[PDB]
């Protein structure tokens, strides 16, 4: 059972949880209700396990793609914003959190990956993936490298895999065919092959994870990385002279990043649903609540209409929304966790060499 009279919130460790905790201190000042923000490891896997038994946090934050599986298992409360509140957020962000016709979470912010480059090392970042090998050969002569990003999570390699034709689930005549998966077609194979060749020719290392790529870019050792808005604040601290721009094309086509909508769901087991609604509607989803989280770690393009004038002053956000314009909003169907687990294993096995590209993607299929 979840404790009555207070709020427990889970949010991923790469987000602005200290800023979110400041919104909870404002909530505690006005109402007396303590808000506890936690960032447990693998929380998108832990939440369905503890929530199924009636435990867990009052509120869970994650990108919208996992909430359909949570909703199918009955783990989420249907939210109840009135029409006036719904008119405060962009319509397409409400579409991201609809499952079986119902609203299952509050949209917070729109996220997309961008190419992040060191202007001192690279004033003209490349427009194509194809020219990165020659750039790396040039920078390696100077003790640098061209590109490092997280190869342990398929979210970061998906824009390249999807560029030439790869897809998750086929959508046709108003519904998905969950048996028609596009992880091993010609387009996906071409993208993953290009990634493996970058590794075979030592332009990247298969072991590179989030922490390693972040450290290398923020110390000026690599000229580019691929990351989302949450990472900009640590780059600001390192004083690297960085820019945010469009992901490179592959075979002449734009990279196709999955677009995520950071969203907040209310635990169906929570006895604090009224408090949770008040916190999310009247404290977080305000100009001053989003500002407080953003000052800690940037959210991206926040879903609240009244903030768009402020977003437009941030050129990193326009770049984020240009990459989102060339991408697709993730499905939220329950099969998404199985899709991600399959792509993650295929990328890791191919990049390491234990399997060829054809063998790995055939196993993901």
């Amino acid at each position, epitope marked *: 059972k979840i404790e009555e009279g207070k709020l427990v919130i889970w949010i991923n460790g790469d987000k602005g949880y200290n800023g979110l905790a400041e919104v909870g201190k404002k909530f505690e000042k006005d109402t007396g209700i303590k808000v506890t923000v936690e960032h447990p490891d693998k929380l998108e896997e832990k939440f369905p396990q503890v929530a199924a038994t009636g435990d867990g946090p009052d509120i869970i934050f994650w990108a919208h793609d996992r909430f359909g599986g949570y909703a199918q298992s009955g783990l989420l409360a249907e939210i109840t914003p009135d029409k006036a509140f719904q008119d405060k957020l962009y*319509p397409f962000t409400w579409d991201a959190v609809r499952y079986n016709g119902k609203l299952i979470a509050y949209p917070i912010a729109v996220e997309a990956l961008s190419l992040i480059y060191n202007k001192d090392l690279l004033p003209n970042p490349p427009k194509t993936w194809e020219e990165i090998p020659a750039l790396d050969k040039e920078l390696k002569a100077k003790g640098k490298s061209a590109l490092m990003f997280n190869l342990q999570e398929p979210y970061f390699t998906w824009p390249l895999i999807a560029a030439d034709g790869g897809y998750a689930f086929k959508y046709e005549n108003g519904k998905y065919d969950i048996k028609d998966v596009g992880v091993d077609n010609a387009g996906a194979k071409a993208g993953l092959t290009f990634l493996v060749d970058l590794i075979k020719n030592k332009h990247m290392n298969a072991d590179t994870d989030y922490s390693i790529a972040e450290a290398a870019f923020n110390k000026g050792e690599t000229a580019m990385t691929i990351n989302g808005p949450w990472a900009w604040s640590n780059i600001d601290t390192s004083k690297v002279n960085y820019g945010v721009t469009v992901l490179p094309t592959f075979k002449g086509q734009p990279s196709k990043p999955f677009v995520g909508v950071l969203s907040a769901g209310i635990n169906a087991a929570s006895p604090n649903k009224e408090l949770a609604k008040e916190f999310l509607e009247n404290y977080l989803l305000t100009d001053e609540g989003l500002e407080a989280v953003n000052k800690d770690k940037p959210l991206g*393009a926040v879903a609240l209409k009244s903030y768009e004038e402020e977003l*437009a002053k941030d050129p990193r956000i326009a770049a984020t929304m240009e990459n989102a*314009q060339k991408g697709e909003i993730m499905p939220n169907i329950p099969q998404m966790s199985a899709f991600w687990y399959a792509v993650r294993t295929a990328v890791i096995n191919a990049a390491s060499g234990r399997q060829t590209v054809d063998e790995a993607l055939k196993d993901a299929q």
Partner: antibody
Amino acid sequence: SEVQLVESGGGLVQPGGSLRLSCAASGFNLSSSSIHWVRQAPGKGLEWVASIYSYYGSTSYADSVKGRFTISADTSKNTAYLQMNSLRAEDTAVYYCAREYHSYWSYSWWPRVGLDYWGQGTLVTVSS
Amino acid sequence: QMTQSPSSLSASVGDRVTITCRASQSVSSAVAWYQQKPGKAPKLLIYSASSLYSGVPSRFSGSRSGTDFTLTISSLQPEDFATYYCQQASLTALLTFGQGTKVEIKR
């Protein structure tokens, strides 16, 4: 099978009057596309009027027509409509219907793309 | 609001032509460009700021620089004298057209 849109219903109407325009689609299923009405007053630029823009059937309107115009559609007839009430002299224009479609749209109709097929337009004159 | 500039520009066959619209208080990259001849319906040129619509000749291209979106015609052809419109789809699901630009024959 060519995609095309055909507007009808234009004519002369008195100020304060009502007029319903029709947009008949062929060569594609209207229910999987977004449908927009755009008008062009004589000698002037393009002005967007109204849209059905989402999988769930959400509509939006320009401020100058809000409360007076209603956009709707009949899926069984593959036809869209613009009901225009309380008309004014300033509503005189050629009225165009146009479709927006992206083959990768799902339940989310993102990203928003271009208006790729337009009709020939129908002329509405409001005058006494 | 999409501020299109200039309202009219004169050019010759073979010129490189540039038209720019500035978006205000907006972060959308859903920006399209249209061409319209007298008496005819508009025709789509560019969408998503920079994607060339299928069948449109290669001399047409779109780009974004901050809040400014630009249509470029690399080598103006005789059939390219017309009026051009920019258009944005806002995140609030509203459409806005620029005022338009007349490309006319210099003499």
